[PDB]
Symmetry: D2
């Protein structure tokens, strides 16, 4: 059940809606980008995973811009949905900011975020 | 001019179509995922960047699945479009495969890809 | 107290010995490199951190080679020692394997490891 | 010939001295850490690589602290020495700064650096 509202341990609220073809839409809120606004994501996942155990490998992208606030950056998560009694999404991510050619070494960040359904 | 057909130094062909709202669609071909097939991406970029020099921070996601071949993985690029006379997209990326809980340490890869318009 | 024996949640045993100049020596065991052998690390940390809260930013490197087994790879952790009543080391890492020029896209891995003193 | 003075395309000067056991010492200068000072590295590489083509997988660590200036950070490169007529070191890296628990999401950076012998 990849469709639903996912949370974090930090406090981020991740509302997603999967697709039959393999698309992935929803909204996103609640910092690393910027705390109090509602941002839009899009992404993809494979529709036919393995059945002798695997994770449904997915990923999405949030460009930090809406009608409230612009942060001139973009964040892309890349993880998998681990299936079980306890639903779990384990992701790496990358935050890329808009810099000049001189400051191009400090543009991209990295990290890890772990998602769950209950909060 | 972010809309168009982008290439690599490896040989990957990246056909993209931007949006006025901030969406990003197109196709993708030509390995790291798997060499000879045509894969679908989606992603986002900010619609209002800075004018006293910056890069348009973007990112997209390819789930390696189509009618020809499945690789059970997903790749997310996260970079910026550097504007000038010579158009340039400089990206980091992450390849996340579908593994079990035991092999969860070797699921995610990392790298860097540099894109251009001429080939 | 950065000097001592650190553990993981996976099961890796990390015995380290700090230095007054800023060096960092010890041993390492217990997979991602290869499970049952004893590998050698070296690394550095800054000797004068901040006192109005910070983490002692450190990092080290293990080349997976000893008298028992060779894996033709190297792993570099890069994190910080968060000070408190509960000692904590939070790290990113990179596993770089020895590949040819053709397979140079899949050489480097990435992940995250969280270290503690009690097991 | 891994022992010697390596350069970059940015301008960083990397003087290294290898070891027979597998150690790796030298100095480092010339930004991402901080521009005009001389920093100390340490690292490791495997002493017995493959002969049917491979890269000598290495890695090292610089803690940005000396008698001139402190930056409260650490950088770890993780790459391979590609052998040939044109010597080449291709690395990923991670810059980890000293942050509090609140700003722990923006501590680690990421990038890529490509090293050569001629400048």
């Amino acid at each position: 059940g990849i469709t639903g509202t996912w949370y974090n341990q930090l406090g981020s609220t991740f509302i997603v809606t999967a697709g039959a073809d393999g698309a992935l839409t929803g909204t996103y809120e609640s910092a690393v980008g910027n705390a109090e606004s509602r941002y839009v994501l899009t992404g993809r996942y494979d529709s036919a995973p393995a059945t002798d155990g695997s994770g449904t490998a997915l990923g999405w992208t949030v460009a930090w811009k809406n009608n409230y606030r612009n942060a001139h950056s973009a964040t892309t998560w890349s993880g998998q949905y681990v299936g079980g009694a306890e639903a779990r999404i384990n992701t790496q991510w990358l935050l890329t900011s808009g810099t000049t050619e001189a400051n191009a070494w400090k543009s991209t960040l990295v990290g890890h975020d772990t998602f769950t359904k209950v909060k």
